[PDB]
């Protein structure tokens, strides 16, 4: 919404392009940026036969969700802390994307006016 | 009793002749019935071989 | 007409209402009532979110790691 | 949708049978007290289509509005969805007003009745369906897509509010 | 024949008020508006020379033509109604009874007994009524579809059978 | 009474907005006397057989046989080689066949031109 | 089973043995148990009658054999005897080749359900195996026409073999 | 629909015609000529006939609406409309 | 796999039995509406069980038994794929029709 | 095949010296027995056609048509019983002789070995139908009907004769087995085009094809009912059986000159189906329907794909059972009402319960509900045509939609609605025409169970 | 079985919102004679219908009572356990 206004009714280059960004090396600006690591191995996703869109980094919690659920039968009112870890993982992973969105945003913000500063000093 | 005669002459004698049909004639043909592999858990065990699939290490445990 | 008429219609007056259709009616609306406040009290974190939405602006350039603007 | 859409269908039909095979709203009215069981049934189902929290419509319609909003669509795709929710609710309130509220714009012979046992029992199982099913099924079905956790608040609450004006 | 001047306005006034109750919906609101238009209808009840009322016709008929509801309340048995021409799938012509196997006719014995005398009643009546209708009709045929009465002695109304043996409106 | 409804071929002028409704001339109202008379006898003769118990089977409907005979037989005897008829004959004749001839020929030529050097999607097609 | 895994390879089946830590006992376990001993038991002994009756009088049926005859390539023009033999031999080989495509599709389809949502990564081997068979089938019998015959296929085989011969010399350069 | 017989219909129309404030109860008759016995005008005749329109539910053709004069033949008209005999 | 797929086959044939009895003209046309009630309600009753193992282990399969056409390379056979969508829709559909025609017995009776 | 030929010709003496009242019983029972004997012809090997004799052979294409003819013959026998009661015995036996002679020529036509022998009995069917159409017709126009039907078929028949005898002098034989086995590519020389042409319009004039179809509405709507079924059910298909035969040698010419007939047909059924929707006579619709259904067959044969040939065979047999049913259905209404106007007798469900069903799936088979063999033939044509050209789909898909449009239209305008009160002669539906429809419909669903027997030799 | 027709004396404009219709028309020298036909609908048991919020409020009184003792029961486990 707000970023939509800053691109459509504002400057498109100022806002990140959702289908193109990021456009800067993530290691650039973070010397020794540690890799977002995997908890559930390839065979974990493979043996669980998880679907691709839910085979993200949070899938390590997701397999735990089903396994309490597949063992909570009969009951369905159990299985609460399992998602509490999962949606929080998706909550923080969405923040990671959001942080990457703002990272590229202020990446575009900084360099454009830095180049504008060069355009001003010449 | 009417419910009972309903079951035998409309439900009970069916479940016999479908069961007779597929578990002796249909399953006797290859790939007639194919069942997906259940989601075997690293951490759970296999019933026939007794092999417990090794589970992954500690989760991030990001308790809210 | 034929034997079996029991519900007797009226003419411009409020019709008779057997208690059975009433008592279940407010019972069902009560049943559909107390279900959602019990669900509300038990799981208020369902209709409304359970995980906060951090504001974008408050994020400083540390996790953003934007190298300084002057250079 | 199959639950409550059907659920209001024979409830409307129960009104039609009781009120001498009439369909126009402009001849309904005053049926709240005189049509008790159907009145509750239609009242619930009218905004059950809109799906108040913790209902068949809640776990589907409210999530649908957020899901399209929390995704990559054309600018007008979302706006029709909120327009849908508002416009659907507006006449969802309308048909109650003409049917039960107001005054009985119906012929003087007061035949209006719903004492038939099959009438009550057929709809009765659809009260428990149209209200309980969304909760039980939602916890009975594992999620298929990534849940929408970090969300900028308003585009979820918008689905609930666009229903009430 | 031709629709008379005060007859045409009665037709237009008919559905115009049905349009009004379609618009007003509420009974009291309709009653208030129906009486207001009643006096409006009575505003120029006088017409004197017929040419003035023809112009008054044009404005009046133009009013009620636009006065239609977009979806006027058509009754279930109204032409185009929900229950209109609904049970025609059940009514069957009376002559089909003669095309019944004797078993069915015998298992409905009293009805076919009174059907037989009704069939007999059709015979002499048709005989008497046709020699009644031919001379009751003046030269040049029938000037109108109105059909002459059974004004003779011991005579049935001419051209009655299909009217009397009409498929009852509730065939069930 | 408002901006008036314009009559159309598939939705004609109503019985209200028609000028003849309020423009009833002495001869126009006079016309609705003999058309009623012929309808009266026409309705009469139908009743003299429809209500006739002696009559059995089906009575002839002159208009229906007039419609069928004119819709089936009397078109060629009334047909003329009029240039207009030949014009509509031509554009609805060889026209559409040449339309679909070119379309399918162009499609086939455009389709065929890539088969001989392997530029189509045919790998999973061994049925024809 | 009558069929063997060399013809129809069935991926091995594992059973994730449960662990119902929940207070309520599982409803499925005895629901399948009752279904077992109120329906299966009557039909098991009934089948035992059927299997034992088959053993009482077991007749025999064999498999029809076909002695190979000279091919259309070695057959004679305008000679209706030999080339008819090659014609029928070619048609039978077509029917067998049709069924080879059937089996590999059956094996491929069986793979997809076996791997479930992992069909994309765990069915590539069966897919490519069918792919090369289908490609070989396309240059084999496809495009011949409704009036296909041994001579018509031989012309197609010769046309393909001369095209690649010209291509091979072109590749030699 | 219950077997609505003419006796119910006959009572309803005369009651409504008595209910009609311009056809007073004491001056209402079974054969009430609206033009002569009751002295109403054409528009009131429309109001009378379309009052029983909504009051009875069924439809009165316009070519039969203006003809229908008296409550007795109002009763007979609805009598032949459904074909009541009891 | 002994339940579930077999149970679905039982559910979809018991609904045909009313038609088979109807065309056999041995059924009684009077209580047939009520006879239809019992069939649909029962067919719904056996529709719940195929859910139970899907909640339990989530197994899904395809039933293809009687081969109709060989059509050279493309064999044709009657085949039902029971997945998440099909499995839990049958009780939803079965419950709906049982209730709506339960209402329709009182409503649709004057014909 | 003389195990079918000899009993069939033996029907002539038996039907010609039977009793004055047993001619119907005797002819019906033994014709059905011939059908049962003909059912044994369903057996086919992998690809070898059953070569019973030098002059007779059959395969998976001839036998389904063979059974169709033999199974059909009792159906006009029972259909004609209605309107042939008011006739002398000698003339009645003459009618039976024409039908049996028509059957006998049909079996020899399908079982023929070489093309010339096939051609002789093929055309020979014109004579029995010419007498049937003209002598026993109903209206003045039937005289113009016979000439239109005769000359149209003959005008295309004679060029084929010249081409056929030309085959014998060039190839050396006209036997189908040798022609296919000694098949040689046909050059594109300007003479060879006419050579290709002369072997085509003979088959497509009686298909019928768009443009060259006017005899179809002028005969089927106008022939006696018994002649109407055999004309629509089988006689049109005589072009189909020939075209699968003659196409074995006429290659690769079909690639070029199929076009002028292809879109002539492709615009054809859509055009014809439009005429069906806007008819006024009952039998005129089914006649116009028959050419519309026959039109997709023309595309099926000409496109020369194995899938289309199977679709051609299935649609061929399915249409025969259908078109016979609707023509029988129209005859039932025409008899009581003594006319064939569509809206003359609308709304007869209230008086004709079983007929309204016999309307119902007969039209539904005309709509081709799944999995009726009509679609199995129709869908196979679609896949073959789509593989030929993608843009094909819109046309005949639109056609089978306008096909759907009318195929309920007479159902609405004959059964749905209110009876005509002046009509009072619709009596109780006699079991004869009633059971006639049963014998029409049950084989359709029976063949639906195991269609694998009617896809022809390409299956 | 009774099909009885009640008294007309109870059904004129009184006891109904038809007061205003009777006088507002009477303000412009008019009379409303058909309000008595709709007097029963605007009176008797058919009058005084609950509001829309009150329409959904039906069953709240017992629903609220069931709700509070249910969450009181909810507090029961977290205290007793
Ligand atoms: C919702 C719809 C809104 C839109 C529609 C709203 C209603 C449309 C009509 C509006 C008022 C209009 O002036 C009324 C008209 O018909 S004026 C012209 C005809 N009249 C004359 O020119 C005088 C001749 N007089 C008579 O014909 C009789 O006096 C009469 C029948 C009137 C009274 O009855 P009397 O007992 O015969
Ligand atoms: C007052 C309710 C919230 C504001 C109105 C609806 C806003 C919908 C979401 C904003 C527009 C889509 C893009 C972002 O998200």
Swiss-Prot record, chain D:
TM ranges are 1-13, 35-55, 76-98, 126-146, 151-165
Q: Which domain of life is it from?
A: Eukaryota
Annotated localization:
Mitochondrion inner membrane
Family designation: Belongs to the complex I subunit 5 family.
User: What functional role does this protein have?
Assistant: Core subunit of the mitochondrial membrane respiratory chain NADH dehydrogenase (Complex I) which catalyzes electron transfer from NADH through the respiratory chain, using ubiquinone as an electron acceptor. Essential for the catalytic activity and assembly of complex I.
Subunit details: Core subunit of respiratory chain NADH dehydrogenase (Complex I) which is composed of 45 different subunits.
Protein's name in the database: NADH-ubiquinone oxidoreductase chain 5
Task: State which stretch of the full-length protein is shown.
Answer: 332 to 496 of 606
Swiss-Prot record, chain J:
Q: Which reaction does it catalyse?
A: a ubiquinone + NADH + 5 H(+)(in) = a ubiquinol + NAD(+) + 4 H(+)(out)
Q: Mainly resides where?
A: mitochondrion
Q: What membrane topology does the annotation report for this chain?
A: Multi-pass membrane protein
Give its E.C. classification number.
Answer: 7.1.1.2
Q: Which GO terms describe its biological process?
A: aerobic respiration; electron transport coupled proton transport; mitochondrial electron transport, NADH to ubiquinone; mitochondrial respiratory chain complex I assembly
UniProt xrefs under InterPro entries: NADH4_N (IPR000260), NADH_Q_OxRdtase_chainM/4 (IPR010227), NADH_UbQ_OxRdtase (IPR003918), ND/Mrp_TM (IPR001750)
- Per the record, the domain of life is Eukaryota
Q: Name one GO molecular function term.
A: NADH dehydrogenase (ubiquinone) activity
Cleaved signal peptide residues: none
Q: Does the keyword Glycoprotein apply?
A: no
Keywords (A to Z) from UniProt: Electron transport, Membrane, Mitochondrion, Mitochondrion inner membrane, NAD, Respiratory chain, Translocase, Transmembrane, Transmembrane helix, Transport, Ubiquinone
**Which sequence ranges are marked TM in the entry?**
22-42, 60-80, 98-118, 147-167, 193-213, 224-244, 257-277, 284-303, 308-330, 351-371, 391-413, 435-455
- Assembly and partners? Core subunit of respiratory chain NADH dehydrogenase (Complex I) which is composed of 45 different subunits.
Name the PANTHER family on file: NADH-UBIQUINONE OXIDOREDUCTASE CHAIN 4 (PTHR43507:SF20)
Query: What family does the entry list?
Result: Belongs to the complex I subunit 4 family.
What does the protein in this record do?
Answer: Core subunit of the mitochondrial membrane respiratory chain NADH dehydrogenase (Complex I) which catalyzes electron transfer from NADH through the respiratory chain, using ubiquinone as an electron acceptor. Essential for the catalytic activity and assembly of complex I.
Report the protein name in the record. NADH-ubiquinone oxidoreductase chain 4
Q: Which organism is it from?
A: Sus scrofa (Pig)
Lineage, highest ranks first? Eukaryota, Metazoa, Chordata, Craniata, Vertebrata
